[PDB]
């Protein structure tokens, strides 16, 4: 219908509800996935209840979730398209960042080339649009920007006499406090010996701290400055009212956990790590002249941020606008590891990436032996691209099978030329909000069929 018409941009209750829902998790065409999910949840819905009372929940929508993981990862593997470059050089317009964004774009590309996460599972994760901030200082004239692969704040050390600059720091991060915490028997009497019990809390914790040997010490919750003394005398520097966001952020970038009742951690894996904390000072009136702390070599390199400048407000935020134009083109180009050969020339071997990979390897179950048996029935849904384009001109099962054979030279059928072409230059292919269209379905789909 309008979903087989999917070599072009030119376009179940709960299902389509969630359809719109994730459709503005990321914006794209509704009907394509409406109809795909229609058909495939139709076979599903035929599984569970009215007849056949199947065990319809485990091990099959499991298989779809796996299908969608492979979908994201591999379909983002096949760009050869005469990519945006012309589109983007054309995107140049719309503001006064002339002559001096190019660094910006080249090096945002660098940092977003830093990124190929494989974090949560057997999954090449991509937390794109989630994992960095860049920042300026309004002052002077802009063009002096200098990048650093790490954080830089204005969050002064817990004690200006603590580390003027730290290196290879391990730290201990806990959403809770260094202050005698909520023991079962809530009791408060004899102020002095109970502040002393707080002192002992602090100090045996400090035993266990230096047993961990942090380098910086940071709580989300609180501390008693007693412990602050206990470690600044040890030299384990400290930070204050410490922001939970980058806490979890970099603790995860580290190996440092946040073991929350360290009576738990009789051992290490709570300690974080990074490379070095280093200040830099400014000196002039008009209190832009501040001091700000480099925090570099964080245990994950998938993160950067820059010294930027500017002598105004409105053109500066307008350069921010170019920077978010770059935000958008970045993650757009990113859903593909930036395009795919259109006119069903990459997509045959794409839908078949499962096919030929898990066939030649075999080593094939990654789909399934039902992707052998049931893989004749439904992954045929991934086999829609051909069922869209070829059967119009050339070949229904034929290029499908003989091109999951693995030529690796992916020109394909000439619907509208009879000889050679691809929609790429024909400028006729739905842009790439459409990919995520396959990874949202099963999480929301496995419950409504209880």
């Amino acid at each position: 219908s309008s979903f087989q018409s999917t070599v072009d941009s030119d376009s179940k209750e709960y299902l389509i509800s969630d359809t719109g829902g994730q459709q503005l998790s990321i914006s794209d065409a509704f009907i394509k996935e409406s109809l795909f999910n229609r058909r495939v949840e139709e076979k599903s819905k035929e599984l569970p209840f009215t007849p056949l009372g199947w065990h319809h929940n485990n091990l099959e929508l499991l298989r779809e979730e796996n299908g969608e993981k492979q979908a994201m990862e591999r379909l983002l593997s096949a760009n050869h398209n005469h990519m945006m470059a012309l589109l983007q050089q054309l995107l140049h317009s719309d503001s006064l960042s002339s002559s001096w964004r190019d660094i910006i774009v080249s090096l945002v590309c660098q940092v977003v080339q830093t990124v190929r996460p494989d974090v949560k599972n057997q999954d090449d994760d991509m937390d794109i649009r989630q994992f960095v901030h860049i920042k300026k200082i309004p002052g002077g004239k802009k063009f002096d920007s200098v990048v650093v692969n790490g954080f830089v704040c204005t969050k002064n050390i817990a004690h200006k006499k603590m580390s003027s600059c730290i290196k290879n720091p391990k730290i201990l991060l806990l959403k809770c406090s260094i202050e005698y915490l909520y023991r079962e028997e809530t009791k408060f009497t004899c102020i002095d010996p109970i502040v002393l019990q707080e002192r002992e809390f602090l100090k045996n914790y400090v035993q266990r701290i230096v047993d961990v040997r942090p380098t910086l010490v940071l709580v989300e919750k609180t501390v008693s400055r007693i412990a602050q003394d206990m470690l600044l005398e040890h030299g384990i520097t400290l930070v204050i009212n410490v922001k939970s966001q980058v806490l979890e952020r970099i603790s995860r970038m580290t190996q440092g956990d946040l073991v929350m009742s360290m009576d738990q951690l009789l051992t290490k894996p709570h300690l974080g790590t990074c490379h070095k904390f280093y200040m830099q000072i400014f000196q002039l009136p008009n209190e832009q002249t501040k001091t700000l702390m480099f925090f570099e070599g964080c245990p994950q390199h998938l993160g950067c941020t820059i010294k930027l400048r500017g002598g105004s407000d409105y053109e500066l935020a307008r350069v921010k606008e170019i920077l978010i134009f770059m935000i958008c083109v970045a993650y757009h180009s990113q859903l593909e590891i930036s395009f795919l050969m259109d006119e069903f020339a990459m997509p045959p071997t794409l839908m078949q990436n499962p096919s030929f990979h898990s066939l030649i390897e075999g080593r094939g179950h990654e789909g399934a032996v039902q992707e052998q048996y049931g893989g004749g029935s439904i992954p045929w849904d991934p086999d829609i691209p051909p069922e869209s384009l070829p059967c119009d001109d050339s070949s229904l099962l034929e290029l499908r099978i003989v091109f999951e054979k693995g030529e690796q030279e992916n020109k394909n059928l000439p619907q509208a030329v009879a000889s050679v072409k691809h929609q790429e230059h024909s400028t006729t292919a739905c842009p790439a909000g459409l990919p995520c269209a396959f990874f949202a379905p099963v999480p929301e789909s496995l419950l409504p069929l209880p």
């Binding site: 179940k12 209750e13 389509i16 229609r38 139709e42």
Partner: protein
């Protein structure tokens, strides 16, 4: 003959209908109306020659009900009805009572009739549906369908036959319909009216859909139309229950919700 609330109807005709009085008269008066077999009844069902207007026969109770609702109905009209803001609700052109001693009519007998627009038009309707939205019961028509002619398909039939019901209405249009549905059902709910269904007519190709709420006059009647005939068995379905049935407010929500699925 007796005409009820001549002034109000006249206003209704022009207002919502924007129907010229002369046109109205011509349709009814000029050519004899053609009869349509109605339901099992017993009550006459007619249509004008032009098929623009439908003349139905109503019971004394229903006619009285009409009078009670007329002020609200009128108000609803002003806020929104066909010329005003289009309402799915039936457009009542006129209500009359004919009882004539003369031989043609039964003597000392009262025949009450309601004239209204006809949702389908004269031209043609390929498929028809009567959607209650109610939980399974008479959600199918056995005898109907017998006619090679247009069958009045019911909810279950819509669900199975015109399953994955193809009614695709534009997104812009969906919003307008649903909004109007919500208001109508709310209006009906206020009145305690129930057991009304949505009549749907379909044209094929770039399709044209015809829809409107019908079976408006029936309210507060717990005891009515006891079921007849034997129920088919072999399948779980309607229960011996329920002494406790769905209320008017409940009916309204279900109606809209069900209708929501019908059009995409």
């Amino acid at each position: 003959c007796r005409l009820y609330y001549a002034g109000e109807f006249h206003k209704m005709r022009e207002v919502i209908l924007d129907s010229s009085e002369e046109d109205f008269i011509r349709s009814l008066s000029h050519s004899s109306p053609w009869q349509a077999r109605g339901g099992k009844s017993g009550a006459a069902f007619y249509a004008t020659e032009d098929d623009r207007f439908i003349l139905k026969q109503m019971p004394r109770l229903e006619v009285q009900s009409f009078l009670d609702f007329a002020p609200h109905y009128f108000n609803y009209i002003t806020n929104a009805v066909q010329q005003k803001r289009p309402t799915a609700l039936a457009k009542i052109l006129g209500v009359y009572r004919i009882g004539y001693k003369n031989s043609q009519n039964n003597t000392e007998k009262k025949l009450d009739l309601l004239v209204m627009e006809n949702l389908f038009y004269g031209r043609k309707m390929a498929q028809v549906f009567d959607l209650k939205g109610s939980l399974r019961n008479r959600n199918v028509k056995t005898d109907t369908g017998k006619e090679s002619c247009d069958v009045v398909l019911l909810d279950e039939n819509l669900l199975k036959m015109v399953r994955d019901n193809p009614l695709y209405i534009r997104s812009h249009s969906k919003a307008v319909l649903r909004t109007s549905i919500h208001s109508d059902s709310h209006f009906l709910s206020s009145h305690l009216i129930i057991d009304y269904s949505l009549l749907v007519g379909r044209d094929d190709t770039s399709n044209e859909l015809v829809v409107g709420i019908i079976d408006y006059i029936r309210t507060f009647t717990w005891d009515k139309k006891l079921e007849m005939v034997v129920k088919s068995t072999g399948i779980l379905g309607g229960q011996g229950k329920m002494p406790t049935v769905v209320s008017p407010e409940l009916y309204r929500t279900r109606f809209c919700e069900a209708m929501d699925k019908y059009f995409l």
